Ligand binder design. Structure first.
Ligand SMILES: OC[C@H]1C[C@@H]2[C@@H](O)[C@@H](O)[C@@]1(O)CN2Cc1ccccc1
Ligand SMILES: [Br-]
Ligand SMILES: [Br-]
Ligand SMILES: [Br-]
Ligand SMILES: [Br-]
Ligand SMILES: [Cl-]
Ligand SMILES: [Cl-]
Length: 833
């Protein structure tokens, strides 16, 4: 908001396979693979068995070219900057005969002075992308060992020598697409005097009465002279000025450091999702020179405190978030890249994912270390939606090199992204890596390497994750928590360690343990736990042709990357469900299974507060069509788990838990106010509609702010008989003083396969309009875990994957911009004879 001018270099690009001298139009920002796809030069990489078919690309080099005009007047601007916000990865940048840059890090933006190099008339930019494979083959050959990066799907684990998105080389839920290109925007900036290279709003203190801030600016002045300037900072809320400060300086050639304090009396605090409004102030800094604003930069700032509490206690070592003075039980998921080709992920896709988190009652996301440091948009959406961000550094599942050159590179990405992200209200903590110390301690490396090589790995770990990264963070983000690794001490098969910090509880899934083990195997903080499902059929039909709808078709197997996966789903299914004979019925019960099992854990974690202080499931989302632990498939479709997670994350929850032939009922509130004079009411109901015995009433119940408390216990013996337990359900409701409902739950006393479910018909009525579909569903008898299925990709539902209770009408709204609709209603009893 200044005298500067910006030219976007996002049109007129062309690409070539090096050596062919053949050029075709390209899209920038973009990827080599998409450019081919666009010209039919590659098949849909996500279809069938096409993974093998597209690998040849990572063995070639790729060249990109563009031209632009510069007028004489633009050339007389004091400064002209070319900015690359992302180059993937080994890129020689040439402009008008000049090598501007040899890029070598995907996660770094490059700002380049180019005015002395530009010409009036046309100017030619040319970028040579060395293959990341062929670039690192010599590095590999000199190493004398293979890094154990199992998720890198190649004989040679070259991923670890490159500062490039780990997941691009393969992963246990991902396709290998080792891509290249200009992956974030190219901008050209014509300005006078100076640019602001950094604007940091440092919060010094915050009380109800006053926020004290330090506006810290790095101004890069590009002219030979000493230029007097007034630096101004304006603070506004909804377009109205709250406070304003200025300062006189004389700017010197080169870098200038400027600090202005500003205070906000009676600050309006940023609150996390569920606790209030995620209020964002506007901070705007300007360099004024005479009458003209030569440089301006702004941030949206949330005024809040975040403290990670990680302290010894009677139970081991705590691990929790206190927000604005209040311990906050974390509710969320682990986030992976939204696509195999990152520039394909649109503004709308970003927005919809944040809607999906907000709607599932989440207050936190982990940006896990095998993906990317996400774009600015991702964090702006987290700020405005009240989602705390746990940021891994981009290291996962393997030890990494630690030589001086490697570390210099990593240091630049650390400094680059820390300054990129440190102004975000949503940013809560840094974490050095995913699972590397657990890897080094427990994954059997000491039998795979010489003792000398093992030790170099262990020394190299400390160099990067206990020295370099914690010290960069101390320097640039000094009031933000850092931890060297998730999980930092706790291991899933070592019970003695579960009271020490955070857990990845992979006993469920990998360890084959029943979902009921989440009730007894409790963490101080769950940072990962998970279970897999096939996506629904419209997503299968996106990759598989009708003749491939078998669990082990070649095409199905190309889309399962846990080699353990498919048979394990069957094993868990069998414990709890009758395994359907049709593949479509298996997919439907698989969704129900994943959702029911996982919510039982989410529930155990909240129920066990304050011992347990958070739960993030593995994983929120998918990068392509695949069988995975996700709760939302690649096309935006909520699996059962997403609806179940929403239910289990509700601010107030009635949690009935039945162990040892006995029912407990807990009231769990993440509310900031205490609820008083509450009534729990329950009744047993058979599958035809009919109350068994009488309503149970528990009056005078209090539900304190931020607690989980037991308010009801009853033995099952003498209340219900084994045949009642298989032919009925508990309905639970919570009402305030005046009989107003604040919560409800349904409880089944037996495993679904043990239920005597009646053959029933779910009937519906449709009232279809533009983009909307109102369904009213009725069934005389209980219909178990119903799935309302439509062929419309990305259709949203007010509800789904729920029990349709006996003779109780149920309204569901389906929306999609593409509604001018086939409905298929599945339920458990239909799946078997
Ligand atoms: O398996 C799905 C995910 C669970 C976490 C998680 O941190 C991701 O890195 C994984 O892909 C891998 N680890 C677990 C894992 C590590 C090593 C071997 C198997 C599984
Ligand atoms: Br310049
Ligand atoms: Br510059
Ligand atoms: Br200075
Ligand atoms: Br070795
Ligand atoms: Cl239970
Ligand atoms: Cl039981």
């Amino acid at each position: 908001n200044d005298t500067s001018e910006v030219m976007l270099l996002d049109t007129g690009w062309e690409f070539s396979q090096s050596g062919t001298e053949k050029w075709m139009p390209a899209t920038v920002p973009g990827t080599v693979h998409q450019d081919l796809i666009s010209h039919e030069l590659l098949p849909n990489p996500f279809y069938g068995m096409n993974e093998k078919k597209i690998q040849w690309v990572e063995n070639e080099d790729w060249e990109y070219r563009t031209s632009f005009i510069v007028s004489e007047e633009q050339l007389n601007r004091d400064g002209i900057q070319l900015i690359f916000e992302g180059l993937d990865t080994y890129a020689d940048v040439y402009l008008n005969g000049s090598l501007l840059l040899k890029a070598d890090n995907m996660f770094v933006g490059y700002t380049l002075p180019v005015k002395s190099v530009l010409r009036k008339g046309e100017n030619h930019l040319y970028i040579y992308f060395h293959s990341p494979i062929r670039q690192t083959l010599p590095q590999y050959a000199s190493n004398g060992f293979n890094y154990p990066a199992d998720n890198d799907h190649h004989e040679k684990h070259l991923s670890v020598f490159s500062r490039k998105a780990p997941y691009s080389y393969g992963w246990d839920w991902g396709i290998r697409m080792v891509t290249s290109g200009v992956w974030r925007p190219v901008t050209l900036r014509f300005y006078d005097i100076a640019t602001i290279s950094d604007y940091y709003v440092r919060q010094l203190s915050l009380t109800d009465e006053n926020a004290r801030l330090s506006n810290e600016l790095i101004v890069n002045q590009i002219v030979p002279q000493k230029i007097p300037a007034e630096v101004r900072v304006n603070v506004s809320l909804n377009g109205t000025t709250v406070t304003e400060v200025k300062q006189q300086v004389t700017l010197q050639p080169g870098i200038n450091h400027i600090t202005l304090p500003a205070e906000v009396t009676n600050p309006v605090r940023w609150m996390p999702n569920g606790w209030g409004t995620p209020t964002l102030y506007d901070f705007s800094a300007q360099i004024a020179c005479g009458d003209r604003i030569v440089a301006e930069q702004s941030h949206r700032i949330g005024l809040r405190t975040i403290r990670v509490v990680n302290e010894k206690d009677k139970d081991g070592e705590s691990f929790y978030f206190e927000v604005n003075g209040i311990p906050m039980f974390a509710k969320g998921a682990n986030y992976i890249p939204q696509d195999a080709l990152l520039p394909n992920v649109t503004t709308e896709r970003y927005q919809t994912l944040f809607r999906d988190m907000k709607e599932a009652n989440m207050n936190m996301v982990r940006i896990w270390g095998g993906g990317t440091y996400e774009n600015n948009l991702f964090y702006d959406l987290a700020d405005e939606n009240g989602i705390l961000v746990w940021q891994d550094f981009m290291f996962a599942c393997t030890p990494y090199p630690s030589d001086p050159t490697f570390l210099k590179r990593v240091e630049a990405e650390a400094v680059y992204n820390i300054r990129r992200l440190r102004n975000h209200a949503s940013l809560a903590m840094w974490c050095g890596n995913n699972e590397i110390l657990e890897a080094l301690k427990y994954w059997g490396f000491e039998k795979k390497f010489t003792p000398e090589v093992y030790q170099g790995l262990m020394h190299g770990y400390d160099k990067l994750f206990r020295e370099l990264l914690p010290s960069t963070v101390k320097e640039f983000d000094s009031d933000r928590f850092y931890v060297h690794s998730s999980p930092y001490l706790a291991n899933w098969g070592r019970p003695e360690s579960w009271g020490t910090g955070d857990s990845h509880n992979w006993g469920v899934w990998y360890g084959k343990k029943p979902f009921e083990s989440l009730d007894t195997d409790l963490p101080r903080f769950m940072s990962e736990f998970g279970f897999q499902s096939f996506p629904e059929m419209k997503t299968i039909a996106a990759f598989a042709a009708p003749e491939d709808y078998q669990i082990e078709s070649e095409v199905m197997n190309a889309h399962q990357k846990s080699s353990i996966g498919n048979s394990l789903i069957r094993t868990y299914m069998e414990r709890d469900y009758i395994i359907p004979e049709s593949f479509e019925d298996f997919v439907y019960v698989g969704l129900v299974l994943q959702g029911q099992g996982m919510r039982h854990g989410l529930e155990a974690h909240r129920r066990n507060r304050p011992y347990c202080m958070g739960t993030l499931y593995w994983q929120l989302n998918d990068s392509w069509p695949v069988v995975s632990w996700s709760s939302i498939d690649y096309y935006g479709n909520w699996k059962a788990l997403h609806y179940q997670a929403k239910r289990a994350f509700a601010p107030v929850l009635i949690n009935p838990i039945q162990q040892n032939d006995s029912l407990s009922v807990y009231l769990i509130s993440d509310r900031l106010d205490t609820m008083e004079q509450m009534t729990l009411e329950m009744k047993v109901v058979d599958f035809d509609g009919k109350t068994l015995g009488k309503k149970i009433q528990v009056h005078s119940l209090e539900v304190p702010a931020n607690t989980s408390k037991c308010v009801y216990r009853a033995k099952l013996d003498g209340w219900l008989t084994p045949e009642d337990c298989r032919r009925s359900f508990l309905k639970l409701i919570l009402k305030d003083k005046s009989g107003h409902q604040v919560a409800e739950s349904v409880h089944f006393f037996r495993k679904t396969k043990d239920l005597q479910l009646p053959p029933t018909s779910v009937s519906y009525q449709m009232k279809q309009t533009d983009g909307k579909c109102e369904l009213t569903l009725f069934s005389s008898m209980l219909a178990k875990d119903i799935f309302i299925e439509t062929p419309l990709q990305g259709a949203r539902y007010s509800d789904n994957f729920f029990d349709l209770l006996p003779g109780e009408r149920k309204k569901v709204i389906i929306t999609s911009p593409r509604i001018k609709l086939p409905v298929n209603i599945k339920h458990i009893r239909e799946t078997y004879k």
